[model samples]
Target: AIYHLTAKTGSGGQSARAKADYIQREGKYARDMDEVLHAESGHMPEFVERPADYWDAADLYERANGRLFKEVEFALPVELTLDQQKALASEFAQHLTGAERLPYTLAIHAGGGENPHCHLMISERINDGIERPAAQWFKRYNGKTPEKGGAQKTEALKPKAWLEQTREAWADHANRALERAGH
Candidate 1:
């Protein structure tokens, strides 16, 4: 299995909405083979029910050079069935995004049977349960008085050790899933 983390930044010409649709296989971003078997989102604001809407707002409101989202892509055990894979991915995605109350999108791709994997794209902006308009949501967070400013973004700069730990955690998650399947 493989696990990798990459940030989608506006400076890199990446759009949060484009990536969301591509992974979810919705609208104009749909790719070949209908690789998306399962898709879900969590911890979204009240006004944003769908991944596309949230991401579209991100693209519009976020700074041009700022990061749009962080994508956690990992390979799933091919031995498991579709339901099993979805369950495993959902659990991991929740652990990473839901625990922090961050908005995120997840997609399970098994196209062409080459690499069965999942994508969990996370927004750094914390939900904080605050009701903010789309224009104010993506603004720079105010630490002292959060409600006065936009949603606070989690620390984007993470150390190498943290990334290593994330990889190890995914390994453990995937291993547990494999064991549950009696593989």
Candidate 2:
């Protein structure tokens, strides 16, 4: 299986713009998305504590592209049916974005020459309020406290086992799907 994750870095504008363009499809990439699934970032049940709306293109780009997103690209087993492939892609999105309460988009790619794949783009900002502290934001900042003004001084680093755990989850979900498909 192919698991390639990417980032927009500090270019949220470009990312969003490209997203719009890709959806509109003036044939920008010599191909296009077969299916697209979007979800609410801060409106799900697990996101009940998410902060109020506070992120926009301005905030996303001003603070060194603080609100940029992450993208994951992985090949779907060519043997899987279209329905099964889409189901697996949706499963992965819900697994990661649902638990973290993050917004995301899954763009399926099957009209290409090589193995079919999907791109899952997820927001980096976990909450609606970009300026506010995330849940337990302080205690995770390398043991550092908030600033003198009570604002979060440091961002929490991801857990050491995040990738490993994520990969494990992906494997479990895909395996379950494969089993159900009798493949």
Best candidate (score: TM-score): 1
- Listed per model in order, the count of residue pairs whose N, CA or C atoms clash below 3 Å is 0, 0
- Top candidate on lDDT is 1
lDDT of 2 by residue, 17-116 (tens): 3553353242464364343322223322232242121223323332453434455656666667878887788878877766445655556765463566
TM-score of each: 0.89, 0.58
lDDT of 1 by residue, 22-81 (tens): 888888755453788899998988778666889999999999877788877788878889
For candidate 1, the 10 contiguous residues with the lowest summed lDDT are 2-11
lDDT of each: 0.81, 0.49
State the lDDT at 131 in candidate 1: 86
In model 2, which runs have C-alpha deviations exceeding 4 angstroms?
A: 1-14, 23-62, 65-67, 111-114, 127-157
